[PDB]
Symmetry: D2
Subunit: 480 residues, 4 copies
């Protein structure tokens, strides 16, 4: 048995009635419990994520099967059997908190690994590529996809205008308009690092790496009609499903695979291996098994732990570094930047975001300082041997630059259509039909000129792809 108290720790005599002039009269200003309780209620909400606002989280463990020390000095990957705690958030992308989990969208697949050498965030999506290859375009892309800023309703004519004029998007769209555009839930779902990263071993040798997560539950998708049926009955079925699996002891898991590529392979490929609109052939760069992630614990509080969770691709650990991927480069900045605003300058002190590894540095103050700081020395260099010092054992690599000059210039070999064609051809006939059907429902009402440009882009990917789409949209393209 416990007292209800104010935040001052004074027990509350009456949590039912305001303080009034007699039993029915107007309310008095001297009602500290009322004001305090209303004032806090009034401040419960914080800004949602600018994208991936709808989501769900869970904790678990990652266990190494095959040490990766040949290729990366990353501590968490150093030994067979090595276990690292994780927190994972899954999400949709475009619509706000509260929006349905039955909509078409990439799904987020964000994993925080609590390593001995710091927190490592792998901030992935289910699909292995992206729409654009430079961060400067991200707000444009997002704005085009988001609900129209007048009507508050998402409009195909807006995002198809942007996508058609951004033909590097063609490969991504060829995945997103398969039925994998609507995963059945978060468990029966693929995961992908998307970007090429750099793995650096104990000799300082670098390889390019890509990450893949393979669901123990298998991949399952929803047709447009299956999605609608679920939407009727539950706008939050994926969030429900994840919680319930875990609660009943049916823990979902994913195996982690990598592909590895020598840096030297750049110059021989017909695409840039750091263009995130591209995948790497699994024939030429086979999947290699690393280990397994099992999710086995729901959070105690959704707001404190899932809503306040902060991931960043720039949360890298020794042995794992960014590539030159220009999309990735922008992300390094944008996540902690947005998080400082969404969560506060001290967001890294929120329990879910805290490292297991020790934190010692000379930063200070900021809104909501709760950590009991002490000491006179908040500057380096200083004369005190016991104060925190740099540690050159932990320097990052020094990647070679091939450019002469600071430039704003697209990558060479953009090759916007080829892989999109390859992917189309890899689809079964059923999958090809679903693709075309899903594309047609999206494009049928879009401006004619934009519609034609979309057809042309998919025609450049593959002539059958393009023609089938044109037939299904009733567009005669013979004259071109």
């Amino acid at each position: 048995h416990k007292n209800l108290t104010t935040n001052q720790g004074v027990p509350v005599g009456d949590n039912q009635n305001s303080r009034t002039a007699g039993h029915r009269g107007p309310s008095f200003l001297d009602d500290y419990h009322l004001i305090e309780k209303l004032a806090h209620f009034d401040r419960e909400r914080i800004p949602e994520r600018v994208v991936h606002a709808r989501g769900a989280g869970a904790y678990g463990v990652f266990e190494v099967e095959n040490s990766m020390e040949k290729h990366t000095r990353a501590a968490f990957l150093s030994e067979e059997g090595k276990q690292t705690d994780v927190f994972v958030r899954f999400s949709t992308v475009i619509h706000p908190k509260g929006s349905p989990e039955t909509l078409r969208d990439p799904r987020g697949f964000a994993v925080k690994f609590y390593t001995e050498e710091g927190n490592y965030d792998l901030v992935g999506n289910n699909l292995p590529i992206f729409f654009i290859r430079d961060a400067l375009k991200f707000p444009d892309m997002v704005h085009s996809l988001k609900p129209d800023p007048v009507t508050n309703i998402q409009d195909p004519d807006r995002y198809w205008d942007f996508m058609t004029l951004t033909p590097e998007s063609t490969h991504m769209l060829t995945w997103l308009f398969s039925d994998e555009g609507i995963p059945a839930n978060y468990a029966e779902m693929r995961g992908s690092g998307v970007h090429t990263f750099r793995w650096v071993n104990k000799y300082g040798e670098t390889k390019y790496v890509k990450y893949h997560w393979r669901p123990s539950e298998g991949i399952r998708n929803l047709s447009m009609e299956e999605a609608a049926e679920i939407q009727a009955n539950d706008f939050q079925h994926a969030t429900r499903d994840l919680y319930d699996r875990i609660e009943k002891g049916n823990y979902p898991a994913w195996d982690l695979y990598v592909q590895l590529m020598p840096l030297s392979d750049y110059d021989e490929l017909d695409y840039d291996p750091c263009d995130p609109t591209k995948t790497w052939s699994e024939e030429d760069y086979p999947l290699q098994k690393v280990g397994r992630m099992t999710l086995n614990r729901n959070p105690e509080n959704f707001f404190a732990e899932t809503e306040q969770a902060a991931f960043t691709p720039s949360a890298l650990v020794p042995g794992i570094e960014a590539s030159e991927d220009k999309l990735l480069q922008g992300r390094l900045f944008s996540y902690p930047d947005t998080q400082r605003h969404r969560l506060g300058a001290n967001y890294m002190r929120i329990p879910v975001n805290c490292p297991y590894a020790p934190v010692h540095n000379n930063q200070q103050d900021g809104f909501m300082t709760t950590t009991r700081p002490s000491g006179h020395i908040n500057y380096e260099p200083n004369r005190y041997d016991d104060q925190p010092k740099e540690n050159p054992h932990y320097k990052e690599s020094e990647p070679v630059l091939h450019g002469d000059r600071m430039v704003r210039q697209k990558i060479e070999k953009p090759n916007d259509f080829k892989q999109a064609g390859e992917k189309y051809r890899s689809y079964s006939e059923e999958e090809k039909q679903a693709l075309i059907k899903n594309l047609t429902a999206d494009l049928k009402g879009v401006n004619e000129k934009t519609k034609l440009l979309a057809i042309c882009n998919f025609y450049r990917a593959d002539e059958d792809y393009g023609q089938r789409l044109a037939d299904s949209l009733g567009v005669d393209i013979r004259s071109y």
Copy 2:
């Protein structure tokens, strides 16, 4: 033709490519356009409304048919034919911003009247009563209705626990679990002030008043199964419907009626006329027509205008005052309190929130001071005749207090069950069946003890009501 610029007004040479070390190398910190554009994108979002987060807005005009100067000095109501601009936001209640408009919930009905004597906000709902009668209980109620703080899913067992132990809620539930719990859209919908207010005429005479909005489009509701059918295909159908009506010139409208009651009738009744769990008889206190509100203009920008709109029941104008209703009394505080956090200390300067009437006072500064302030004098009293002075012509009334002590104590004659029974008996058989059906779906999974207490509460309202609900739930209540 225009340049794309930075916020510094410098034309942008390249809005496609980040600045890099050659065409494929990593990105440079000296890229002001990239950082500025990503930084602003990163800060687009502000906190959603703590309740009523999902909603839609429109502008229109209110026109007086019958002048009300006999009963209120309110300027906007003073003359036949007098037109006043309005902004209106409609909303659901519980779920966040992106949530479906097909869920059961009261609907918000908030009207901002831009009057010559200031802005008047009539912050209503469709349904004419409320679940509780004291503001101290509002965070409890909301917390019980909101998604469970662990699962992120709304749970009938949680809100039913609260509602059953809060039997003043019995009348509201009797309305909410009719099919009016899911209005077909925002146009075909009732509006209510809910609270009793005080109207004060030029002689200082006071009457109690209640407000009612009657849709020109008629009231139409959705069954559970009709709601699901819509939800399958559109999670923002009401928002769509409102915009589209207005866009095609099919302007929705509502006629404003009041009921007026002498303060001296308090003793003539078996309920407190300022208990917002109660309605007033339309036989005894007939509806009197005031005028008509027509919505005829969509906003230019949803975020700037609808999302940032701020209403408060405390935005009262001379002649229109609060009653002693304890629920209302807390609302007077909570809305501007939450708005200062949600929108900033200067939220009253956001264009939609600005009065048409002049503003002059001695307030200053605050985040985002955009108004070009000037002058040396920011204090009153002062020696300068041309500086703003109080105007005793605009004093409010001095309501009589019947209590002689500061107390926390429930009102006399709570009478929690009677009007609920009256409302039940007023329903057609079809409506009664829908009520029972809707209640049974909601209650069938809740804790047995809580389930029985619900039945007992609705039994106290009306024995048939109760028994029918018990039968439908399979609960044998013979032993009691």
Copy 3:
């Protein structure tokens, strides 16, 4: 020996050099340590207190000498020898952080008592009265005293315009323009609760109380010329003095006295005993010793503990209640209100502000939730006997109301000049000379009309007071 780390817990390899294109080239965006470190530095600052921004804090102990249970049920006062931890902040008032401690001003004297029944804040000043008696005037008074909003320099012509037109200020000014307007430091300084409060014993009997703190070090003040001498060489001498005393083991202390007055004495006094422009006679209502407060510990971190400290007069504990004082009534609201903005919605979780008594309630969420919340139940009433419940043993008293109407109307018996005269006459000749000298230096440049009105006010207090001031200003007052 410790590593310098990022906030992710990764050891920093180089805390000296940014990451660049060769040894002298421009900087790269992929420098997480640089961006994280700069970004936190960039966010160190929070808003300063709107008033009392300059100040210093310390911890200590309060020990009861005479138990007060006859007059108050306050737990911390219940018996002889009982010790309670305190935190105390002293301050100036008007000028910002950084401003000199040698300026004229009241000094703040804020004491936070960490009691077993919750935190009790006695938010005092050195001087025992105030300039105004209604909180509605506080922004005006402050705005008049603060630096001119055009020039950023405090202007006597401004605050004298306000004070002269606000003659209830006459008593306060008669204290503030003695040399006690500049205490020598924070240790050799009076403390005052200022307001009358209500003390309520276990039988529910109420008395009016006033609080007084008497320095073990004695009261010492600075002349204008002694202040100027110190100001030349140290703009933080009081903050220095406090810290150094405590560091040397020379702990400053204050004895707590109260005066106690029956509520029934209201009606026979010639002033309102809850007018905070009034003191009570120490002959008629003698000082009664309660105990002693010793300050013996400097904070570990000035920002975290002294800058983020939050006191409110509404932080009351059972047995100690507000009076009807209209100045106090506004303060009950304004402190937690300003704190929510200055510090965050969760400021009560900042360690210095935390109670020693348990906190359990149903509030949730808010920016920077760091407390690891858990559980499904965040609403009351609920069906769970182990969840926090109200406890009616802790109800507050039910003060009698003498008014029958909601009014805006000055108190009866304002008696603006009498006690000012009494205070003037109580001064030694030396003190009277200092008063006149200090007033003359402040008034000599102000508008002639305002200057006359000031003279007139102090003349109404005492004719010698007024004439001496007029002579010293060279103002001929014969025609009046």
Copy 4:
């Protein structure tokens, strides 16, 4: 004559009394004027600048005498006689907002030019060099100089520990401990761009440039004893002096000079021309006159205009670009980053910060959106010819990179002592004496080892310099 109103535009009937239970009773919650007025008062303050918190601003005009088109395409410099409006803020550095203007510090000298091709900020200081040459060290430096985080008092032992271990500081200190460490006021003061920048002409030819501002009022400085004497009587004398000059029509002015250096001179020098611890010889790179700035208008509102002013070295205009200076590079990021936090995401809409040039881009929303946005298109590329487009005429240069790797590594030729010695020798004997005197007063209490290292650093600058300092400190350095 005007009414006092609420922010709702309702006239205020009584700005003197709170609303109470009779003329002497407690206060009612239903007092919207009181709560609104207090609540805004409670939110007046925003965070101060993390450095240069104390300062003063003024508007004026810059007029070109010699067009610079041969060296830079900058529009504002293109024609003889061309006038551009400016806003200028001057400041100290270390202590907070209310702190004295008599302290030792660099002074800030920040100029915002409202040009036809965007706002150009030249964010200078009076002194022409800086303590450090890499932004990664800035928070360390600042933390060492700032008041101790325990005591809130600045401590020479702290900043001397940092400076001695950071010997690149030796030149800066040799300026700052002359009497120019305390300018007499803001008018009789030097100004400096400090950094080398890049000027780019219409042919794309680049030169290195340095800026210098020469006061029409001449340079005047204060001895330690003259500073103390002013401090006694006025803690804001520079702010006062600026305002009063301008109010009287005695407008202060500065002539703008540049030095220009070919990029190819890098190899011709014994220091890095982009090392901001270095000046360029005026013999070898003579001062060339550009024009004159006159300050002639005080702001209307100190908070709205001077306090909310935002300057950034990254507010560059076509023809004026950053250099590779690593100190400057960090600044490009840190100003807008801090400003977003200090002022809000939309701080560029605060009137003083607004460009005169048109602003058109696809950014949207953010706290306090007051600009009336409209339109459906917030993304580029788009199909609409009339929407804002990039303009390749406004591309920046493509500086050549000499490094082939991403590195963290000090510049070559740091040459930490030489120019410090040159500057010492350039001092008159009087100035040398003042230098030594000022240094000795600062060093005499610091840790002996730190003290010795300081002496050694200044000895390496110049043996006389070092020996004189050692003698004056009573440190025997025979034996080194």
